RNA sequence: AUCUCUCUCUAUGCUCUCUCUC
């Protein structure tokens, strides 16, 4: 990855407006879909799973497994 | 020594006869040391008769069969082919088994 | 009530053929060559080569009209082998099981009454 | 095009290097027909076995 | 990232005569990088890889070098090469030689331009090679004449 | 369903129907689709396992080596290659992870799918080296069910093995994507790829 | 009367020798 370790609005924005529709989010489908590659994918995740916006499956850390409310 | 009696093959009271070439080699080999098989089989596999039953105009025909005098000579007459190997004891036996 | 045409199966120990003719022959329905339908040199005396073989030609044959069949057939000879190689069998098996209705089978191989001094030379062929 | 067809017997085991089986295969489409046919690894009886293959057949392998 | 196919179509053609970059050999032959058209991944079953039994694979095939060779299976949905080395002709050879170089060259044209400036590059691919097939036959031809 | 009074604290899930319907971790081992005829008792399901992790014999046996859940041959087959050989935990979590994924993508019950996957990649024509000399030439032979279902199921796990090596795709994602497009849809997976390109090859020999 | 039917290169090599007592 070319860098793209930042937590930027725009791509904030982006993640917002993208993880809905799709049915799986986890941080290496955010690096297949051109956003953030690697560590802060991570904290976006967590900081979005603060109420609502993205429900749990998981129990597990290091794979996540999280899927959008219908 | 001499290895059989009949030292080649059934030339006696004969002698220098008349040659025949192989089946596989094609060699030219004399019509004693020849090897004469004789092939006797029906044109299709034992398997392939049923559908041929099925599927024809001439209904209860039977088959035809092939009869192929082999010259298989002694030298390929062996490869996994016929004839073999046999025990010097065991070689004074002209039975067909 | 059927249509009879002669198959005239020539599955030499190398290259099979099943050139289906007329009654008297002269006038050729369709031959499909049996080492054409597979480009490697090593499958042409193959059986199933020869199978494909037959079944193009029951296709070509079985849907334009000739429904039944007399099957020559012969592996060379004369001077050659007398003997039906590898290839005939599959090919009257493809026949039969296309669809085709047979009109009796027949082996016409070329034996000589005593030939001309064939291949070999004396010694003959060394594996 | 698909085609299986059923097995029953094994007519034991055949090749150079071996393990490769073959077998008595019977058409659960029509049990008129019995072939011999090749088959690579562990096969029992009455097993449905899917052929691509249509037609053709071999015993030896070498 | 750089790809698209060398002609006009996605897709290649039966009996389609190409030439094949060796990667690595595996059980059915090897998974070599088709030359003439894109990079899409193929095989040369062990078969119709020489026209005599030579013993040795790797100094009349080699891994990493070339070969010439044709398209026997194409299946157009997703995509499998059944491909061979054999069925390629006498002669034939140097027209497949001479095919391969100029697909080369015409690879090399397209790259500097994207260097200079990035943007798609199947949009490039578009706008200089595809027009110029499609009225005849090859980019190379079409180059040829635009020089003469 | 129906709460059993102990001393002990035990989980609401398993006081439910878990004690009534035994089928899996939380997963249902009913439906039962084979889309080809029977190739039961070589694709095993029936026996409703609560978690892919059985210490049996099925090695000491002709064919007992069927009776072993899908499941866990699966788990069993992604322990390879020298960093994971034994650890049979990790496996069977990410057996648990792909089955989440399936889940979550493109709905459906996961076993049903990695079912089709397994009938849908395996060959019907092989590929022997028979020699005619020891040369380059191969009979085409016609697969025993076991057999290429064990195959079917190395592949798959080749699969996601070829897509973990660097890469940001943790294994049981990858292998859940394999999975479905074995099943049916694209068809693009690797392991499918590499059946159909042995399946031509067989075709084209004899 | 039941066979069934397989396959090719491969060159050479110099360092001894042994009995008893009836
Ligand atoms: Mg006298
Ligand atoms: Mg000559
Ligand atoms: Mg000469
Ligand atoms: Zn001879």
Redesign the pocket.
């Known amino acids: 990855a070319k860098h793209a370790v930042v937590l930027d609005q725009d791509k904030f924005d982006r993640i917002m407006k993208e993880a809905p529709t799709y049915r799986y989010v986890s941080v290496s489908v955010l690096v297949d879909r051109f956003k953030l590659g690697g560590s802060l994918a991570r904290v976006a995740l967590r900081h979005l799973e603060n109420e609502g916006i993205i429900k749990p499956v998981s129990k597990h850390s290091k794979q996540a497994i999280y899927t959008r409310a219908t | 020594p001499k290895k059989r009696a009949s030292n080649g093959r059934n030339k006696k009271g004969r002698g220098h006869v008349k040659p025949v070439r192989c089946v596989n080699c094609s060699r030219s080999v004399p019509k004693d040391k020849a090897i004469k098989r004789m092939?006797?089989?029906?044109i299709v596999?034992?398997?392939a008769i049923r559908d041929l039953s099925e599927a024809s105009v001439y209904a209860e025909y039977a088959l035809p069969?092939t009869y192929n005098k082999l010259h298989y000579c002694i030298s390929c007459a062996i490869?996994?082919?016929?004839v073999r190997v046999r025990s010097r004891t065991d070689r004074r036996i002209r039975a067909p088994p | 009530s059927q249509v009879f045409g002669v198959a005239r199966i020539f599955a030499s120990f190398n290259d099979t053929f099943v050139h289906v003719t007329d009654l008297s022959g002269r006038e050729t329905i369709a031959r499909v060559t049996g080492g054409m339908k597979v480009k490697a040199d090593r499958d042409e005396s193959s059986?199933y080569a020869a199978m494909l073989a037959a079944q193009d030609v029951a296709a070509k044959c079985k849907e334009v009209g000739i429904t039944a069949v007399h099957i020559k057939i012969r592996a060379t000879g004369g001077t050659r082998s007398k003997t039906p190689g590898?290839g005939g069998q599959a090919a009257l098996r493809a026949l039969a099981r296309s669809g085709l209705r047979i009109g009796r089978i027949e082996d016409v191989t070329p034996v000589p009454s005593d030939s001309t001094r064939k291949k070999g030379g004396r010694r003959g062929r060394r594996? | 095009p698909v085609t299986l067809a059923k097995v029953i017997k094994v007519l034991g085991r055949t090749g150079?290097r071996g393990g490769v089986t073959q077998v008595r295969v019977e058409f659960l489409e029509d049990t008129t027909r019995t072939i011999?046919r090749n088959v690579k690894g562990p096969v029992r009886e009455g097993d449905i076995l899917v052929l691509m293959e249509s037609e053709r057949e071999?015993?030896?392998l070498? | 990232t750089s790809h698209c196919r060398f002609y006009e179509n996605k897709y290649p053609e039966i009996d389609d005569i190409v030439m094949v970059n060796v990667q690595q050999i595996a059980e059915m032959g090897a998974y070599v990088k088709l030359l003439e058209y894109d990079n899409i991944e193929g095989m040369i079953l062990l078969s119709e890889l020489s026209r005599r039994?030579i013993?040795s694979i790797q100094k009349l095939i080699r891994v990493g070098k070339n070969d010439v060779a044709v398209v026997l299976r194409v299946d157009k949905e997703k995509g499998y090469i059944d491909l061979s080395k054999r069925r390629v002709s006498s002669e034939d050879i140097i027209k497949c030689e001479e095919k391969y170089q100029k697909s080369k060259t015409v690879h090399s044209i397209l790259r500097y331009c994207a260097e200079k400036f990035q943007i798609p590059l199947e949009e490039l691919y578009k706008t200089i090679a595809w027009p110029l097939s499609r009225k005849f036959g090859h980019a190379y031809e079409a180059f040829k004449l635009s020089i003469i | 369903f129906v709460p059993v009074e102990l001393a002990t604290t035990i989980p609401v899930e398993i006081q439910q129907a878990q004690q009534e319907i035994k089928l899996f971790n939380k997963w249902s081992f009913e439906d039962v689709e084979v889309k080809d005829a029977s190739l039961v008792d070589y694709i095993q399901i029936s026996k409703p396992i609560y978690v892919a992790h059985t210490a049996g014999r099925y090695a000491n046996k002709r064919f007992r080596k069927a009776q072993c859940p899908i499941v866990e041959r699966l788990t069993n087959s992604l322990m390879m290659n020298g960093r994971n050989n034994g650890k049979k935990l990790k496996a069977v979590r990410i057996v648990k992870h792909t089955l989440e994924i399936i889940n979550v993508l493109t709905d459906q019950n996961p076993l049903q799918v990695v079912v089709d996957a397994i009938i849908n990649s395996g060959p019907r024509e092989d590929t022997t080296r028979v020699?005619?000399?020891?040369?380059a030439?191969r009979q085409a032979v016609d697969v025993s069910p076991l057999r290429r279902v064990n195959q079917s199921i190395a592949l798959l796990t080749i699969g996601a093995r070829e897509a973990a090596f660097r890469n940001i795709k943790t294994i049981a994602e990858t292998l859940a994507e394999e999975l479905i497009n074995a099943a049916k849809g694209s068809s693009t997976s690797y392991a499918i790829k590499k059946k159909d390109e042995l399946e031509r090859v067989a075709k084209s020999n004899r």
Request: net charge positive.
């Open positions: 092939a006797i089989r029906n596999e034992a398997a069969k490869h996994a082919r016929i | 059986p590898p594996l | 150079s011999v071999a015993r030896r070498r | 039994r013993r | 020699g005619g000399g020891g040369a030439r």
